[PDB]
């Protein structure tokens, strides 16, 4: 069986000639994915592996578009060819299953659909046999983070030959010697275990499902489908970025009217604890006090921020909060945090309190309190909650039905279901969720638009204490790996880079000031933090104006140029909403440890309109180690026929507001 992208450049061949069912993929008539196996093994049920033959293919196609409630673009185009391939094996130990393939111009998705059949009752998958066999893997280069490690998704990216990537998380991005870029991920991860990629024979990446503590991967009753497995393929790195395949593979919005989900910018009592000017726990330096929260709310109201995150408001942080998962209350504030007074103040200022639920990995202590916790927040006019699951890999703690503690993975079926339960319950209270230590993004924000963002990668917080902090290349890695999954709460915008001393050997963002501004356009999220202390923004009002101006919701987004681990340039057009007319464009560019010159055409600007570019760029002598603050701000009249030379300092960047003129 064969299915091709609409333009014909991607071609998938599905076969039954090998030991098992298999597929392969060519791009512009060069094989990029060799024969790759399909099937399952189960704990007790007979395997779905060899001796299955193709009995039927069903071809169809799609050419449609749909609108996002919020996002990186307003209109999403869905154009693909589709084939459902049915496999059958005769008895004894026979069976049948289908695989559905969708071929887009930017990549392919496939999933298994196992129908009701005699003897398929309560089953437990122990292995998914799916492979991604990369052709010419000996000359390919990969950019990856290890899977199953003690620190979950929070690793800096490795740059290695593809054959060195032994056990990796997705999105898993690499390029072959021809320059073709490929990224493997998954979409609509629902009631199933996350896929890790395990390199077997060289270049053969086998699905490695994250298991329950008991050792099985996925529990199902009867007929079941898998999540989609996705293979993005493009001639350029930015072709991976500019694809909507992950969203297109998810089910449409199930929450109805989601106008109560509000993209916007926020600040927080947060960074002070990470740089040790405040504590999460009670005492003389407690961050989460009524007085401090009102001070942040006044600042937010004055400078145009929608909400104030406050961490450490609830009892249980005293001591070493990493070990306090059993004792957190999600309804009882500390005595110095007057939530009723802050509810009144939020209505008086128009600035909302943003809630915070850190579990330190104990999800049963959270689950038992969750209904009361969201009721309190709904009563308190709280519309967004940041959740947290800080614990080492494999050390989620749950209490089973017999009262016995078990350890689970953040990305097993158990936690996949746990996260979605939290999001669905929050939606009943009109609360949106920002998940730290999450399951990776698989596009479910389409289906549940209150799941607005997540962390699931090293963000700004590692620049306070990472030892070492994130390297200069980190953003340009994220843009082509983690960010292919969906939005990230990076918490950009640190203006005081000197709190631990300057130079290359201290814990600090290893960037220039202009790169901190560029992050607001480079890293998409519907909510963007201005992460720093308010007084640090008051010290730099001209630079702060960009953060005040920049939206977080976009009618269109275009990655204009870039290279993995080196640089990226984004242009985005604001969505018409709230104070934004919908006419302004924004640009952000960042580099790695190297200074870089990038030539950019402005032909993305609307034809026939004049713009005033407000350009925030590295000063002539800027360099991140000892001169990160040199900054130039320039105004320049431009149109679509103009061009721009970006001059990025070492770990530098540029941020631009293109203000449409009447
Ligand atoms: Ca974290
Ligand atoms: Cl994580
Ligand atoms: Cl960084
Ligand atoms: Mg580089």
Per DSSP, the residues of 561-587 read EEETTTEEEEEEEE-SBTTB-S--EEE
User: Among 21, 9, 8, which residue's Cα sits nearest to residue 129?
Assistant: 21
Pairing between β-strand 158-161 and β-strand 204-209 as defined by DSSP bridges: unpaired
Centre of ligand 3 from the C-alpha of residue 585, in Å: 24
Centre of ligand 4 from the C-alpha of residue 473, in Å: 6
Are the beta carbons of 128 and 220 closer than 8 angstroms?
A: no
Structure tokens at 615: 């350009």
C-alpha distances out from residue 274 to 21, 287, 291, 500, 535, Å: 51, 11, 20, 12, 16
C-alpha distances out from residue 325 to 283, 310, 389, 436, Å: 20, 18, 9, 15
- E-assigned strand segments in 107-225: 107-114, 122-128, 131-134, 141-144, 158-161, 167-168, 172-175, 181-187, 195-199, 204-209, 218-221, 224-225
Same domain assignment for residues 210 and 337? no
Same domain assignment for residues 269 and 139? no
Is residue 399 classed as helix, strand or coil in its secondary structure?
strand
Centre of ligand 1 from the C-alpha of residue 366, in Å: 18
Q: Give the count of beta carbons closer than 10 Å to the beta carbon of residue 227.
A: 23
Segments forming the whole domain that contains residue 662: 254-662
User: How far apart (Å, rounded) are the C-alpha atoms in residues 101 and 231?
Assistant: 11
Put residue 468 in one of left, alpha, beta given phi > 0 → left and psi -120 to 50 → alpha: beta
DSSP state of 71: S
Could you tell me which residues come within 8 angstroms of residue 407 by beta carbon, excluding any fewer than 6 positions away?
213, 394, 395, 396, 397
User: How far apart (Å, rounded) are the C-alpha atoms in residues 237 and 173?
Assistant: 10
Q: Helix 513-522 crosses helix 541-549 at what angle (to 10 degrees)?
A: 0
Centre of ligand 4 from the C-alpha of residue 143, in Å: 11
CA 102 to the chain's CA centroid = 23
Are the beta carbons of 39 and 129 closer than 8 angstroms?
A: yes
Is residue 548 classed as helix, strand or coil in its secondary structure?
helix
Same domain assignment for residues 245 and 274? no
Are the beta carbons of 622 and 591 closer than 8 angstroms?
A: no
User: Among 475, 473, 467, which residue's Cα sits nearest to residue 500?
Assistant: 467
Are the beta carbons of 533 and 651 closer than 8 angstroms?
A: no
Same domain assignment for residues 489 and 602? yes
User: How far apart (Å, rounded) are the C-alpha atoms in residues 342 and 352?
Assistant: 9
- Helices (H) and strands (E) in the chain — how many of each? 12, 38
User: How far apart (Å, rounded) are the C-alpha atoms in residues 619 and 302?
Assistant: 29
Ligand nearest the Cα atom of residue 592: 4
Peptide bond into 171 cis (omega under 30): yes
Which residues face 112 on adjacent strands?
A: 99
Pairing between β-strand 107-114 and β-strand 204-209 as defined by DSSP bridges: unpaired
The secondary structure element, H or E, covering residue 590 is strand 585-591
DSSP state of 192: S
Sign of CA dihedral 151, 157, 158, 162: positive
Ligand nearest the Cα atom of residue 512: 3
Last residue of a domain, one of 219, 236, 253: 253
User: How far apart (Å, rounded) are the C-alpha atoms in residues 477 and 335?
Assistant: 43
User: How far apart (Å, rounded) are the C-alpha atoms in residues 638 and 659?
Assistant: 10
121-158 burial, b at 16+ Cβ within 10 Å, e below that, comes to eebbbbbbbbbbbbbebeebbbbbbbbbeeebbbbbbe
CA 128 to the chain's CA centroid = 24
- Binding-site residues for Ca(2+), in ranges, read 154, 437, 455, 461
Q: 95: burial class by Cβ within 10 Å (0-12, 13-18, 19+)?
A: buried
Centre of ligand 2 from the C-alpha of residue 130, in Å: 25
Centre of ligand 1 from the C-alpha of residue 458, in Å: 7
User: How far apart (Å, rounded) are the C-alpha atoms in residues 44 and 34?
Assistant: 31
Sign of CA dihedral 589, 591, 594, 598: negative
User: Among 166, 131, 161, 125, which residue's Cα sits nearest to residue 143?
Assistant: 161
Method: X-ray
Are the beta carbons of 428 and 381 closer than 8 angstroms?
A: no
Structure tokens at 146: 């290890």
Can you spell out the DSSP letters for 289-344? -HHHHHHHHHHHHHHT-SEEEE-S-BTT-SS-GGG-TTT--SS-B-TT--HHHHHH
Same domain assignment for residues 378 and 262? yes
Centre of ligand 2 from the C-alpha of residue 37, in Å: 30
Structure tokens at 656: 């631009």
Same domain assignment for residues 15 and 115? yes
User: Among 433, 490, 77, 486, which residue's Cα sits nearest to residue 258?
Assistant: 433
For the chain, what percentages of helix, strand and coil (3-state, to nearest 5) are there?
A: 20, 35, 45
Are the beta carbons of 592 and 566 closer than 8 angstroms?
A: yes
- Binding-site residues for Mg(2+), in ranges, read 565-566, 592
Are the beta carbons of 590 and 519 closer than 8 angstroms?
A: yes
Same domain assignment for residues 248 and 260? no
Same domain assignment for residues 224 and 284? no
CATH of the domain at 296: 3.20.20.70
Are the beta carbons of 520 and 528 closer than 8 angstroms?
A: yes
Structure tokens at 584: 């302004």
Please provide the distance, in angstroms rounded to a whole number, between the alpha carbons at the two ends of the chain: 56
The secondary structure element, H or E, covering residue 463 is helix 462-465
Structure tokens at 102: 């969708």
Same domain assignment for residues 326 and 455? yes
The domain tally of the chain equals 2
Structure tokens at 448: 């549940």
Centre of ligand 4 from the C-alpha of residue 540, in Å: 30
Structure tokens at 68: 């996002």
Are the beta carbons of 326 and 363 closer than 8 angstroms?
A: no
Are the beta carbons of 449 and 258 closer than 8 angstroms?
A: yes
DSSP state of 105: T
Are the beta carbons of 524 and 660 closer than 8 angstroms?
A: no
Centre of ligand 3 from the C-alpha of residue 156, in Å: 10
Same domain assignment for residues 224 and 351? no
Ligand nearest the Cα atom of residue 155: 2
C-alpha distances out from residue 128 to 39, 40, 44, 149, 433, Å: 6, 5, 14, 21, 31
Same domain assignment for residues 209 and 320? no
Same domain assignment for residues 243 and 289? no
Ligand nearest the Cα atom of residue 567: 4
User: How far apart (Å, rounded) are the C-alpha atoms in residues 244 and 241?
Assistant: 9
- Binding-site residues, in ranges, read 154, 437, 455, 461, 565-566, 592
Are the beta carbons of 625 and 502 closer than 8 angstroms?
A: yes
Last residue of a domain, one of 235, 253, 271: 253
Computed on alpha carbons and rounded to an integer, the radius of gyration of the chain in Å comes to: 25
User: Among 257, 349, 355, which residue's Cα sits nearest to residue 314?
Assistant: 355
464-491 burial, b at 16+ Cβ within 10 Å, e below that, comes to bebeebbbbbbbbbbbbbbbbbbbbbbb
Are the beta carbons of 530 and 296 closer than 8 angstroms?
A: no
Ligand nearest the Cα atom of residue 409: 2
Ligand nearest the Cα atom of residue 565: 4
Is residue 111 classed as helix, strand or coil in its secondary structure?
strand
Measured in degrees and rounded to the nearest 5, phi and psi for residue 64 equal: -145, 180
User: How far apart (Å, rounded) are the C-alpha atoms in residues 645 and 619?
Assistant: 14
Active site residue 574: no
Ligand nearest the Cα atom of residue 358: 1
Centre of ligand 1 from the C-alpha of residue 307, in Å: 20
User: Among 410, 422, 321, which residue's Cα sits nearest to residue 370?
Assistant: 422
Centre of ligand 4 from the C-alpha of residue 470, in Å: 13
Can you spell out the DSSP letters for 616-633? EEE-TT-BTTTBTT-EEE
Structure tokens at 126: 């122990």
Last residue of a domain, one of 192, 227, 253: 253
User: How far apart (Å, rounded) are the C-alpha atoms in residues 310 and 393?
Assistant: 26
User: Among 368, 400, 363, 41, which residue's Cα sits nearest to residue 214?
Assistant: 400
Centre of ligand 3 from the C-alpha of residue 111, in Å: 35
User: How far apart (Å, rounded) are the C-alpha atoms in residues 39 and 413?
Assistant: 19
Can you spell out the DSSP letters for 228-288? EEEEEEESSHHHHHT--HHHHTSPP-SSS--TT---EEEEEETHHHHTTSSBSSSSTTBS-
Structure tokens at 437: 């230590």
Centre of ligand 3 from the C-alpha of residue 474, in Å: 6
Pairing between β-strand 158-161 and β-strand 95-104 as defined by DSSP bridges: unpaired
Residue of 358, 461, 473, 574 marked active site: 461
User: How far apart (Å, rounded) are the C-alpha atoms in residues 523 and 509?
Assistant: 16
Pairing between β-strand 181-187 and β-strand 307-310 as defined by DSSP bridges: unpaired
Is residue 373 classed as helix, strand or coil in its secondary structure?
helix
């Amino acid at each position: 069986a064969t299915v091709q992208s609409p333009d014909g450049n991607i071609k998938i061949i599905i076969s039954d000639e090998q030991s098992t069912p298999s597929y392969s993929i060519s791009f512009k008539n060069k094989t990029v994915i060799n024969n790759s196996a399909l099937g399952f093994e189960f704990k007790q049920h007979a395997p779905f592996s060899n001796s299955f033959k193709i009995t039927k293919v069903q071809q169809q196609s799609t050419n449609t578009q749909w609108q996002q409630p919020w996002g990186e673009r307003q209109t999403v185009v869905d154009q693909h060819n589709e084939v459902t391939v049915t496999f059958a094996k005769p008895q004894p130990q026979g069976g049948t299953y289908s695989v559905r393939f969708k071929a887009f111009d930017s990549g392919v998705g496939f999933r298994y659909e196992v129908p009701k059949q005699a003897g398929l009752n309560n089953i437990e998958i122990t292995k998914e046999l799916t492979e991604f066999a990369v052709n010419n893997s000996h000359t390919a280069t990969a950019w990856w983070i290890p899977a199953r490690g003690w620190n979950r998704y929070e690793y800096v990216y490795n740059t290695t030959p593809l054959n060195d990537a032994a056990l990796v998380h997705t999105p898993f991005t690499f390029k072959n010697q021809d320059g073709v870029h490929i990224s493997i991920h998954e979409a609509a991860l629902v009631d199933y275990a996350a896929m890790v990629l395990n390199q077997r024979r060289p270049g053969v990446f086998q699905a490695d499902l994250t298991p329950w503590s008991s050792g099985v991967a996925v529990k199902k009753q009867g007929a079941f489908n898998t999540p989609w497995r996705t293979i993005q393929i493009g001639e350029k790195a930015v072709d991976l970025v500019n694809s909507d395949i992950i969203l297109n593979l998810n089910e449409p919005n199930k929450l109805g009217d989601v106008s109560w989900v509000k993209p916007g910018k926020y600040i927080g009592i947060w960074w002070g604890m990470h740089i040790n000017t405040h504590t999460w726990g009670s005492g003389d330096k407690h961050g989460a006090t009524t007085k401090n929260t009102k001070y942040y709310m006044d600042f937010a109201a004055k400078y145009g921020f929608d909400g104030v995150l406050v961490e450490g408001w609830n009892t249980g942080w005293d001591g070493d909060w990493f070990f306090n998962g059993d004792v957190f209350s999600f309804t009882q504030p500390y005595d110095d945090f007057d939530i009723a007074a802050l509810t009144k103040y939020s209505k008086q200022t128009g600035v909302q309190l943003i809630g915070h639920h850190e579990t330190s990995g104990n999800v049963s202590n959270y689950r038992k309190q969750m209904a009361d916790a969201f009721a309190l927040y709904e009563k308190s006019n709280v519309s967004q909650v940041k959740t947290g699951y800080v614990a080492d890999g494999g050390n989620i703690k749950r209490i089973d039905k017999n009262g016995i503690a078990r350890h689970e993975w953040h990305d097993g079926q158990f936690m996949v279901n746990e996260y979605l339960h939290n999001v669905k319950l929050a939606a009943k209270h009109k609360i949106s969720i920002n998940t730290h230590e999450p399951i990776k993004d698989t596009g479910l924000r389409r289906t549940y638009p209150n799941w607005i963002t997540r962390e699931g990668a090293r963000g700004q917080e590692f620049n306070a204490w990472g030892t070492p902090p994130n390297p200069p290349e980190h953003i340009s890695m994220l843009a082509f790996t983690r960010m292919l999954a969906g939005p990230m709460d990076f918490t950009p915008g640190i203006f005081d880079l000197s709190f631990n001393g300057l130079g290359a050997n201290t814990n600090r963002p290893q960037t220039t000031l202009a790169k901190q501004l560029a992050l607001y356009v480079v890293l998409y999220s519907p909510i963007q933090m201005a992460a720093d202390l308010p007084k640090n923004y008051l010290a730099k009002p001209d630079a702060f104006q960009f953060i005040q101006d920049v939206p977080t919701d976009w009618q269109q987004s275009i990655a204009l140029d870039g290279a993995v681990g080196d640089f990226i340039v984004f242009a985005r057009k604001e969505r018409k909403r709230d104070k934004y007319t919908g006419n302004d464009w924004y640009l952000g560019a960042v580099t790695d440890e190297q200074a870089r010159t990038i030539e950019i055409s402005l032909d993305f600007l609307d034809n026939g309109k004049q713009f005033e570019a407000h350009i925030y760029k590295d000063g002539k002598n800027a360099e991140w180690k000892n001169n990160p603050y040199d900054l130039t701000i320039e105004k320049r009249l431009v149109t679509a026929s103009d061009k721009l030379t970006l001059k990025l300092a070492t770990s530098g960047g540029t941020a631009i507001r293109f203000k449409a003129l009447l």
